[PDB]
Structures are given as structure tokens and as C-alpha cells.
Amino acid sequence: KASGTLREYKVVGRCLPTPKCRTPPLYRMRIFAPNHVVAKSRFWYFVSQLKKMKKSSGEIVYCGQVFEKSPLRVKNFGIWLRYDSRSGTHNMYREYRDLTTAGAVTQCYRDMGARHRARAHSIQIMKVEEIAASKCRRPAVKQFHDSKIKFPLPHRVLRRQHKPRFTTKRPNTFF
């Protein structure tokens, strides 16, 4: 499993109809994946973990991308994690602050790869829940809960160093 910018796919599936059971139950998951092919692959992975169902012994009924119901509203997201270390598998709970669920899960994959070297094949997303201003347990998220937030951009180091590279003025950083 690799990553790009992630997308959220509602994938439902069931088993093939048999003479012993003509109407199998339908199972739904919310797979975070770059595209729908690997979304269906991770769906078969988690359903093969949970229930007795393989890809040849079943079918995906519908795989479709679900979109953010309010993309313009900033939200807190609590994501439950089951990852694998160099030692045995560990469980975590992370909180992020982003517009979309798939964006928060993307930030979660980059943050797990940055902090703990948890790769996308070792990370199993349990579930993501949107959170109000309360019910938050992380100070890096709770420091942005302010009615009148106020901070400068103190050491605003400049970029565009190489368009004209040789200059007379030493560059400024107080802006």
C-alpha cells in the first residue's frame, strides 16, 4: 500500500449467492485510499480479516467515493489507529484539524511516517470521528481553540533564492 492525496470510498460487498444461502448480508466500509482499485483491494483485505470472504468467493456490490458534506468548515478529527512497529502491533488515538476527512487521514499517514515510521501497509485505520470544540485531549489541537487567535509570522525566512541569484541587497526577513 502506497499513498498520494487520499480519498474516502464507501465500499459495500457480499458473498456470491449459493444454494445454501440465496441472500447473503451486505457489509459496508469506508476505505481511505488514493483510487478505487486500491480501495477495493483494501476492502477485500479488511473483509478477509473480519469475515469469511475472499475476492473470488464474493463480490463488491458498489464502490463509490463519498465527498465532504461541508468542505468549507474547519473541523477536528479523532482517528483511531492500529499500526505495526519493529516490535508488536500498537494502538493509538490521534487528533488533527483539517477541512476534510480524507485530508485528515492523509495528514495522519504523513504524521505516522514522520514520527514512528509507520508505513501505509502497516497502518490500519479503525475509524475517524468529527469532534466539536470540546472532547479533545491533545494540546497541539487545543491550542488552536481561541475566539480571537493572534500570532505573527516571526521568522518569515524568504524563498525564491535563485531568481536573480547574485544580488547587492542582503535579504530581509521582518515582514
Binding site: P139, A140, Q143, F144, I149, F151, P152, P154
Partner: protein
């Protein structure tokens, strides 16, 4: 993580005049001037109130190693205000078993000669830091008084004559000899 703001205020009394050229603060008052250059410390130093009643120090978007510097800037400002108003007086006693340690100042308090430490013949000359006055006090047998404004200079000058009188190649748990710092206070109490 990066903490969005760590602020701290220092309320200066009316006997103190402080100002700042960027991160270079200067504190003048009764006993003299004291300057300190807080460049390469990388904080914000605002100075507010009518007639500059308080010095406010900010750290914006700093993690733990730079959040640990706001209170040390505040502590250096407290020590500098204390050195300007009340001064620093360090008392240090000459502890000896048999040989009485002879201490004599030479110019005013600048050069200090230490003699008869463990019966040695080598005299110990110590130059004090510029601004630290050494004296032999009254109503006490063998005791040195270091007066000054800068706590850095006064305590470094105390550490020099404390480390000059050390016992070599013996059991220092038995040979308890030397000039040791006993009291740390001010010149005037107010």
C-alpha cells in the same frame, strides 16, 4: 510541539529606569548602569506602561528548548534590577583546621593575596572581575565580603577564590580547608 505563545511580564519599580535597543537592554538607577545583550537569544522584548512600567517577553512558535528561555530572561532581569537597586553582597568564611589563612586586598579589592593555606609557601594572587569590590569585614575573624552590581561577576569572583583554595592529593573529606561561600544577600535591604 510548537507552542503558539509564551509570555511573561516584569513589573519594574519606580526607582529603576530600563530601556532597550532591540534585544540589548540597559538598566540604570541608584548604584549604576548594567547592560545585557540578549541577541542570539531570539525572543520579543516589548516595554509597556507609562514611564515603562513593565518589560514583557514573548516567545512565538517555540518548542520546549526555547520555551525554557523566557523564565531565564525574566530571572536575569530580576537579578539586574536587584543589582541596580540593592546590589549583591556575598559573604564567604575562611574555614581552616590549623593554619590561619591570611587574606589581604592590594589596590582596593582588585588583587587578593591568599597566604598560609595548608602551610604552603606559594602565595595565591587572584584578580577580581571588573566591578567587584573585595573587603575584609568587621566584627568577624576571617571572612571576605564581595560587593557589586552584576551577580555574574560577583559570583564568578567568589568561585575563583573558592577554587584557588583547594586541597590537592589528599582526602578533602578530612581536610576541610578553604574560603567557602556562606551567605548571599544584598548591600542594602530596603
Amino acid at each position: 510541539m510548537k507552542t503558539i505563545l509564551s509570555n511573561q511580564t516584569v513589573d519594574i519599580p519606580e526607582n529603576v529606569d530600563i530601556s532597550l535597543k532591540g534585544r540589548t537592554v540597559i538598566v540604570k538607577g541608584p548604584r549604576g548602569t548594567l547592560r545585557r545583550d540578549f541577541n542570539h537569544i531570539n525572543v520579543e522584548l516589548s516595554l509597556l506602561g507609562k514611564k515603562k512600567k513593565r518589560l514583557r517577553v514573548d516567545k512565538w512558535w517555540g518548542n520546549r528548548k526555547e520555551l525554557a528561555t523566557v523564565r531565564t530572561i525574566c530571572s536575569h532581569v530580576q537579578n539586574m534590577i536587584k543589582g541596580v537597586t540593592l546590589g549583591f553582597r556575598y559573604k564567604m568564611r575562611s574555614v581552616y583546621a590549623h593554619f590561619p589563612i591570611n587574606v589581604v586586598i592590594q589596590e582596593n579589592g582588585s588583587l587578593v593575596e591568599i597566604r598560609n593555606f595548608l602551610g604552603e609557601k606559594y602565595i595565591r594572587r587572584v584578580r577580581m572581575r571588573p566591578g567587584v569590590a573585595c573587603s575584609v569585614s568587621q566584627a568577624q575573624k576571617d571572612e571576605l565580603v564581595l560587593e557589586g552590581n552584576d551577580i555574574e561577576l560577583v559570583s564568578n569572583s567568589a568561585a575563583l577564590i573558592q577554587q584557588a583554595t583547594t586541597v590537592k592529593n589528599k582526602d578533602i573529606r578530612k581536610f576541610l580547608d578553604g574560603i567557602y561561600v556562606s551567605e548571599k544577600g544584598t548591600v542594602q535591604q530596603a
